[PDB]
Structure 1
Amino acid sequence: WTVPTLNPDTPSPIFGGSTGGLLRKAQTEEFYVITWEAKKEQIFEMPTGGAAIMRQGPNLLKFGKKEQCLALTTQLRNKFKLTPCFYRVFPDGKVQYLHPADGVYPEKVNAGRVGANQNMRRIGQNVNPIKVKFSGRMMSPAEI
């Protein structure tokens, strides 16, 4: 498996538009693109409101925040048995592939993943806040 490359030419689902879509943040900060392959034309629900028709084959939609792309991913995966992926697109044209991060969806354990933010103790074994006082900022005993 290798990181896919976004194709901006991909056609988008049939949709008449709405007032729930992108704002000035997309022009200045970042936006998100989700793509998937559809087996047939089918009506699905937009996370921004309304019904859209996915074209047979490649599809492409743009969203304002990451949660919107993953919300549609959950719908497509569970209700239609599809395998979408999405990216983060910066105003200068840079594209950052996001999901699934390593080609395998996170709920399925995969080799080569390195644990992060794992504490080798129980919650009840955290130290008292007095022991981390005056550490340079506000920090919980769970941060050590």
Structure 2
Amino acid sequence: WTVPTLNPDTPSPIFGGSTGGLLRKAQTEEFYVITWEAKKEQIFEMPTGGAAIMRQGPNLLKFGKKEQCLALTTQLRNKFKLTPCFYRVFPDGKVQYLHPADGVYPEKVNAGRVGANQNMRRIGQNVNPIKVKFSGRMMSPAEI
């Protein structure tokens, strides 16, 4: 598996246009772009409100936050049995691929992943807040 690329010339699903679409965050900060390959033409629910017909073949939608792309991914994955992937797009044109960043979906184990943010202890074995006072910032005792 290799990291895929964004084709900007991918046909969008048939949709009349909502008021729950993009805002100035897409022009100033970022917007996220989802892509999947469909098996047939079928109506799905848009996460921003309304119904839309997907096209047979590749599809392309752009959303405003990550949770909208996860909601559409979960809908297209549990109801239609499809394999989508959504990217991160900056106004410079910078494209950041993620989900599945491993290529395999995170709901099953894959070799090569490195465990991050894992405390190797219980939750009752955290220290008291007196032990982490007067650091450079606020610290919960679970940070150490």
Q: TM-score range by the shorter chain?
A: over 0.9
Shift of 1:86: 0.5
Give the TM-score normalised by structure 2: 0.99
Q: TM-score, normalised by structure 1?
A: 0.99
Unmatched runs of 5 consecutive residues or more in structure 1: none
How many pairs were matched up? 144
Unaligned runs of 5+ in 2: none
Deviations 1:65-117 (A, max 9, x none): 01100110000000000000000000000000011111100011000000000
Q: What is the CA–CA distance in structure 1 between the aligned matches of 2:80 and 2:9, rounded to whole Å?
A: 24
Specify the SS of the correspondent of 2:67: helix
Q: Quick check: which one's helix share is greater?
A: 1
Structure 2 distance, partners of 1:123, 1:96, is 35
The CA RMSD measured in Å over matched residues stands at: 0.4
Counterpart-to-counterpart distance in 2, 1:121 and 1:99:
29
The percentage of counterpart residues that share the same residue type is 100
- DSSP-derived class of the 1:62 partner: strand
Once residues 137 and 31 of structure 1 are traced to their aligned partners in structure 2, the CA distance between those partners, rounded to angstroms, is 32
Q: CA deviation at 1:20?
A: 0.2
